[PDB]
């Protein structure tokens, strides 16, 4: 089933390299610019969005009026929220890089994150545009056997749960 996953525009922590999860940061000026560039580049399909500010605002600037679902939220980093990637302990960096076995204190385990995301995708009844987060797009891409990193404000269309159709990056 055709689904378009959109990574929200940049926030300050994306520039600073800090783990951004449920911290409700706003888009930067550049992030809003990136969101506007998406308007007209995405198909006219029903839309869904994470309820976090940066995602909702991206959907709005991209010309959509999405139905909100917390299930589309980025992973909850708990006590690691805001931690600099640079300073992340080796076993944590690798855990995140290999995308396997991770459960920060006060947060969500990667397993719970995946279950939440995939259960949501399974429930979709028709093609749609999903405004969501980097970690969500990465979970989906990795499950499809591909590199899960995409630029902020970019999108990826997939035939769920089979393959990636296209990666759309705008400048």
TrEMBL record:
Gene3D superfamilies: Phosphoglycerate mutase-like
Residues at which substrate binds: 7-14, 54
GO function terms (MF aspect): phosphatase activity
Keyword Amino-acid biosynthesis: no
A GO cellular component entry from the record: cytoplasm
A Pfam family: His_Phos_1
Keyword line: Glycolysis, Isomerase, Plasmid
UniProt signal peptide: none
Domain of life: Bacteria
PANTHER family: BROAD-SPECIFICITY PHOSPHATASE YOR283W-RELATED, HISTIDINE PHOSPHATASE FAMILY PROTEIN-RELATED
Name recorded for this polypeptide: Alpha-ribazole-5'-phosphate phosphatase
Organism: Thermus thermophilus (strain ATCC 27634 / DSM 579 / HB8)
């Amino acid at each position: 089933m055709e689904l378009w996953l959109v990574r929200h525009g940049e926030t300050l922590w994306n520039r600073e390299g800090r783990l951004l999860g449920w911290t409700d940061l706003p888009l930067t000026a550049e992030g809003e610019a990136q969101a506007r560039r998406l308007k007209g580049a995405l198909p006219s399909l029903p839309a869904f969005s994470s309820d976090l500010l940066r995602a909702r605002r991206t959907a709005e600037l991209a010309g959509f009026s999405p139905r909100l679902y917390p299930e589309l939220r980025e992973i909850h980093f708990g006590a690691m929220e805001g931690a600099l990637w640079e300073t992340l302990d080796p076993r944590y960096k690798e855990a995140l890089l290999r995308f396997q076995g991770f459960h920060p204190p006060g947060g969500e385990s990667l397993s719970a994150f995946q279950e939440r995301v995939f259960r949501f995708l399974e429930g979709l009844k028709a093609p749609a545009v999903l405004f969501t987060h980097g970690g969500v797009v990465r979970a989906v891409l990795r499950a499809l056997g591909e590199d899960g990193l995409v630029p902020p404000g970019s999108a990826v269309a997939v035939d769920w749960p089979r393959r990636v159709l296209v990666r759309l990056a705008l400048d």
